[PDB]
Amino acid sequence: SMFKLLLIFADPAEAARTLSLFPFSLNKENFYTYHTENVLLDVMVLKTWGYRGVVQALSPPPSGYDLWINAGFAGAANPNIPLLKTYTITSVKELTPTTSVEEELEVTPIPRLPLAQLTSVRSPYRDGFHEHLQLVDMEGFFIAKQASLVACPCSMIKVSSNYTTREGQDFLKNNKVKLSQKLAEAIFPIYSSFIDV
Amino acid sequence: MFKLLLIFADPAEAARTLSLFPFSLNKENFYTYHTENVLLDVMVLKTWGYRGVVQALSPPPSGYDLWINAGFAGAANPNIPLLKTYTITSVKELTPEELEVTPIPRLPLAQLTSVRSPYRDGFHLQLVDMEGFFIAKQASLVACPCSMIKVSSNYTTREGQDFLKNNKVKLSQKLAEAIFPIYSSFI
Numbered sequence: 001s002m003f004k005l006l007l008i009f010a011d012p013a014e015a016a017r018t019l020s021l022f023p024f025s026l027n028k029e030n031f032y033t034y035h036t037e038n039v040l041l042d043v044m045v046l047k048t049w050g051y052r053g054v055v056q057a058l059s060p061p062p063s064g065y066d067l068w069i070n071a072g073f074a075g076a077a078n079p080n081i082p083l084l085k086t087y088t089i090t091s092v093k094e095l096t097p098t099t100s101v102e103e104e105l106e107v108t109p110i111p112r113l114p115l116a117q118l119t120s121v122r123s124p125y126r127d128g129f130h131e132h133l134q135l136v137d138m139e140g141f142f143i144a145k146q147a148s149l150v151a152c153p154c155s156m157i158k159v160s161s162n163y164t165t166r167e168g169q170d171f172l173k174n175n176k177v178k179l180s181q182k183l184a185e186a187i188f189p190i191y192s193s194f195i196d197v
Numbered sequence: 198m199f200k201l202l203l204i205f206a207d208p209a210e211a212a213r214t215l216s217l218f219p220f221s222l223n224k225e226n227f228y229t230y231h232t233e234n235v236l237l238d239v240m241v242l243k244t245w246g247y248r249g250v251v252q253a254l255s256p257p258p259s260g261y262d263l264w265i266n267a268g269f270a271g272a273a274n275p276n277i278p279l280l281k282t283y284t285i286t287s288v289k290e291l292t293p294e295e296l297e298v299t300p301i302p303r304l305p306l307a308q309l310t311s312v313r314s315p316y317r318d319g320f321h322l323q324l325v326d327m328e329g330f331f332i333a334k335q336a337s338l339v340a341c342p343c344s345m346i347k348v349s350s351n352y353t354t355r356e357g358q359d360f361l362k363n364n365k366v367k368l369s370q371k372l373a374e375a376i377f378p379i380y381s382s383f384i
Contacts, residue, residue, distance in 0.1 A: 021377070189378065192374070
């Protein structure tokens with residue numbers, strides 16, 4: 001199966017509806033795989049246990065794929081971002097709040113999705129709304145940087161899951177199925193594009 | 198908001214499509230899903246062929262904007278490969294009558310013949326099934342457009358069902374992959 005596509009989700013809730021789209025199996029390496037025609041589709045979920053993801057979830061980075069897609073939920077830190085909307089990311093910044101030091105990497109935009117910028121922070125933003133932030137997640141920068149180590153292109157799909165306030169967290173808690181479904185709906189046409197018949 | 202009814206003749210044919218969305222089970226063999234702009238209902242017949250269609254679709258439900266019958270179909274011509282998803286342009290009854298069917302975009306085109314009992318006469322037919330004509334007739338009663346997605350599941354030669362039985366998952370998944378974007382065409 002010539003074209004090899006790795007899908008990376010931060011947690012099981014994000015992955016759930018994509019894992020329903022295809023008849024995946026768990027392989028002996030303990031992750032999900034499916035193949036048809038020329039396409040291999042693998043899925044990794046970074047945090048299935050515990051209170052935090054660990055660096056060894058993607059270290060050493062998986063080798064041999066032709067594309068990685070990180071699909072996940074992201075908070076909206078600007079009120080002009082509606083919720084339940086799927087974006088593709090142009091660049092992702094890691095931000096360290098205690099020092100204000102940032103790093104930033106470009107990521108490969110997916111066709112036909114609207115563009116957005118992503119900031120990744122270790123602790124979820126409940127800080128309210130910020131003039132200079134759009135979407136906010138936890139794992140995007142980590143994944144893009146790991147992709148750079150194997151020279152593999154990386155794309156991101158992020159669905160706006162909640163506003164970045166205390167009161168806004170309930171929407172994330174209560175809409176995980178709808179949000180995961182949006183990710184699945186965005187992944188499918190990408191997978192379809194790489195079928196070479 | 199757009200209202201779409203999908204009809205499958207049996208659970209194995211429907212199984213992968215039903216995995217595409219977090220459907221609710223409204224009643225036996227009737228599954229519903231909606232977003233703000235699109236309602237997607239799925240009916241699975243309780244038996245095959247014209248008897249299953251009469252049982253489930255008489256009276257025909259009103260209120261939908263489109264009906265889609267998706268299913269496995271036999272190929273009555275060796276030039277039709279198996280495991281290929283077609284959309285239907287017209288449907289006729291082998292054992293009588295013909296009806297136009299609305300093609301789904303970006304799918305190969307075929308004509309369908311519906312039979313009242315298994316067809317194993319080998320190889321001027323294209324795809325052969327048991328429900329489509331009767332479903333299209335019920336759609337006409339409610340003046341609702343009808344489209345069909347038919348994946349070639351077997352040749353119409355003796356023991357041809359062995360290919361279908363061996364490829365049920367792949368065949369069901371082909372239908373699901375044709376249906377998933379259709380839902381997105383109305384959002």
